[PDB]
Design a protein around this ligand. Structure first.
Ligand SMILES: C[C@H](Nc1nc(Nc2cn(C)cn2)nc(N2CCOCC2)n1)c1ncc(F)cn1
Length: 275
C-alpha cells in the first residue's frame, strides 16, 4: 500500500478515516478503513506496532480483516465495514432489531472472543462501541488498541480506563485475563438488551448507584466497594431472566467461576433456538 493512492472520503472517529485505495487513478479501488495516531510518541508508536501484528495474526469471521500497512508515518489499513459501531446501529435501527437479533450478535461476539482466547490474546476494551456491523446479519470485533498477549507462563497480564466495563480484579490489581474479558462481555450483553437507551448505560447506572455527587478519584473506590458488596447493573426492561442470569454469571467476583466463551456461545445459541 502506497500513501499517495489513499483518497480521503470522511472521518470515522489516534483517529480513523474512510479512504479509497485507488492506484489506477480511476475510482475503481475499494473503500478501506485507515487508522493512524492523532499526536504520537515512541511508546504510543511502540504499542501501535503490536496492535498491527496482533490484527495481522488474526483470521476470523467476527474479527475485522487486516489488509495491510503504509509508511515513517505508520497507518493501519483494514476492510471497511459499512454500518459502523454496533453501539450506534442499535440506536439507529432499534425498530428492526429484536431479541433474536441481539442474541445473534451476542453469539458472534462470543465466537470472536473464543478465537482470540486460543491465541492467548486479552482484548481489554470489549464494549459495543468496539463492535462494527458488516451487515444486518453480521458483526465483527473492530478494535484491538488495548489488546495484550498473555505471558507463556501466566494466565493474566498486569498493566484513562473504561472503569464501568472492568472487573474488580482489573480495578483493584490491574490484572487482565480471559475471565476479565468475560466480565466485560457481560456488560456488552447488558448494553445490547438496553438498546443503548441513554439513561441505562453502564456509566449512568453505576453513577446512579454510587451517588451522582461522587467525583474523580473517589468514583473508582466507590465502584470497587459497590462490586465488592454485590451491587450490579439491573436487569434491563424486557430482558428475560435467563438472559440476565448469563450477565450475572459473567459478573462473578470469583475469577475462576466465570464461564468460558465456549459455554456462553452454546447457552446463547440454545436460548436463541427456543424463541
Ligand atoms: C471510528 C470508527 N467508526 C466507524 N467505523 C466504520 N467502519 C469501519 C471501521 N473499521 C475499522 C472498519 N470499518 N464505520 C463507521 N460509520 C460508517 C458510516 O458513517 C458513520 C460511521 N464508523 C470505528 N472504528 C472501530 C470501531 F470498532 C468502531 N468504530
Amino acid at each position: 500500500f502506497e500513501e499517495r493512492h489513499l483518497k480521503f472520503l470522511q472521518q470515522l472517529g489516534g483517529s480513523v478515516e474512510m479512504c479509497r485505495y485507488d492506484p489506477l487513478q480511476d475510482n475503481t479501488g475499494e473503500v478501506v478503513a485507515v487508522k493512524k495516531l492523532q499526536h504520537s510518541t515512541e511508546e504510543h508508536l511502540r504499542d501501535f506496532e503490536r496492535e498491527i501484528e496482533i490484527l495481522k495474526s488474526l483470521q476470523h469471521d467476527n474479527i475485522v480483516k487486516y489488509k495491510g500497512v503504509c509508511y515513517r508515518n505508520l497507518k493501519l489499513i483494514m476492510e471497511y465495514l459499512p454500518y459502523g459501531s454496533l453501539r450506534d446501529y442499535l440506536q439507529a435501527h432499534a425498530e428492526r432489531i429484536d431479541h433474536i437479533k441481539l442474541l445473534q450478535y451476542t453469539s458472534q461476539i462470543c465466537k470472536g472472543m473464543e478465537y482470540l482466547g486460543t491465541k492467548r490474546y486479552i482484548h481489554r476494551d470489549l464494549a459495543t462501541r468496539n463492535i462494527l456491523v458488516e451487515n444486518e446479519n453480521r458483526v465483527k470485533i473492530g478494535d484491538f488498541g488495548l489488546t495484550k498477549v498473555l505471558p507463556q507462563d501466566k494466565e493474566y497480564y498486569k498493566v484513562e480506563s473504561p472503569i464501568f466495563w472492568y472487573a474488580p480484579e482489573s480495578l483493584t490489581e490491574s490484572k487482565f485475563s480471559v475471565a476479565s474479558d468475560v466480565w466485560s462481555f457481560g456488560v456488552v450483553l447488558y448494553e445490547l438488551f438496553t438498546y443503548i437507551e441513554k439513561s441505562k448505560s453502564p456509566p449512568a447506572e453505576f453513577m446512579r448507584m454510587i451517588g451522582n455527587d461522587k467525583q474523580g478519584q473517589m468514583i473508582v473506590f466507590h465502584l470497587i466497594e459497590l462490586l465488592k458488596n454485590n451491587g450490579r447493573l439491573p436487569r434491563p426492561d424486557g430482558c428475560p431472566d435467563e438472559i440476565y442470569m448469563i450477565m450475572t454469571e459473567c459478573w462473578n467476583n470469583n475469577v475462576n467461576q466465570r464461564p468460558s466463551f465456549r459455554d456462553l456461545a452454546l447457552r446463547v445459541d440454545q436460548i436463541r433456538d427456543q424463541m
